[PDB]
Amino acid sequence: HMKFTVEREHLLKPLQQVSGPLLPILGNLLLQVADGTLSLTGTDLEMEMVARVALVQPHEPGATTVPARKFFDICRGLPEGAEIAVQLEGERMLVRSGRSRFSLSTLPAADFPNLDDWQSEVEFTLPQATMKRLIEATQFSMAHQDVRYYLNGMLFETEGEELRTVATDGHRLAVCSMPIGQSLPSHSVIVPRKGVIELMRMLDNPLRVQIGSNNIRAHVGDFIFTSKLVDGRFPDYRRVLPKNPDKHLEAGCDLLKQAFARAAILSNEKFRGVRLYVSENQLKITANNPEQEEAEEILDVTYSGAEMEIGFNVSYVLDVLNALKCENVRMMLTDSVSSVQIEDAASQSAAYVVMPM
């Protein structure tokens, strides 16, 4: 029955990737030798990650499941360049290399959880860098463990020739759109928070994406990731974007980040409120706490609108600025009770909307 012999460095990166998503069967990896190929699959029932390793040595077809973390740690603990020999034998898999011998327990491959067949309704390819940019630009705005399950995920929207990602936790929002070269149908789904984290780590140049009505799949090199989609209806970003900001402020991304990072130190540990005074070519950031401590930062910026005060959760601001790895930032204000739009001054690819305190 199942047998293969492979170099350790052939297995390390795949075993690692498919272990990402991790009942006892769920702690196991499905192993499948077929057609001169080993397949490794890991699953949490919501999503699954499949890796393929070409087998250039004698092998025999078959399948079993083995504990993921013990199998990885064994192959990782083995010396650089080792030949790992695997074979199934009743209720145990045997892994052998030099005078190192291991006997792992198995669970039947028939028992291993399957994600049901589904149909792709939307298909496109795009470079990995673009999938990264889209996820990096908005991931941080996802709600963590909100009862609004539809917020514990990321919207993926295809519109015209653009793929767009949206993320919000109700208090702040991030939207990023990137051009992809093929006219696409209108389609809008929510990928769960975990799937977004997993799909992000498989980027590590073309990714092929397939999207059904309750499923998303990403093919990347020798990896196939698939996830359930989150049920429900995501908020419309067109509708959170400030209606028409009249007041535009420009400043250095780093100088602004650092002013805020310093003010943040003496803001409320709970609420993290800082105050912004905008005036002709100047931003005053202030913070105070229950200790009666206070910080005050004055910056030169480019602004000529009217004067206004506005408060913010400084962490929301720092998050945005940390994600905008750029030179100058654009703050788009309206009034002291309305949200602000923040953008890279040189690029409209990504917008950020943060609600005031």
Binding site: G170, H171, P235, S339, V353, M357
Partner: peptide, 5 residues
């Protein structure tokens, strides 16, 4: 900290 909508 206020919610959108």
């Amino acid at each position: 900290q206020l919610n959108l909508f």
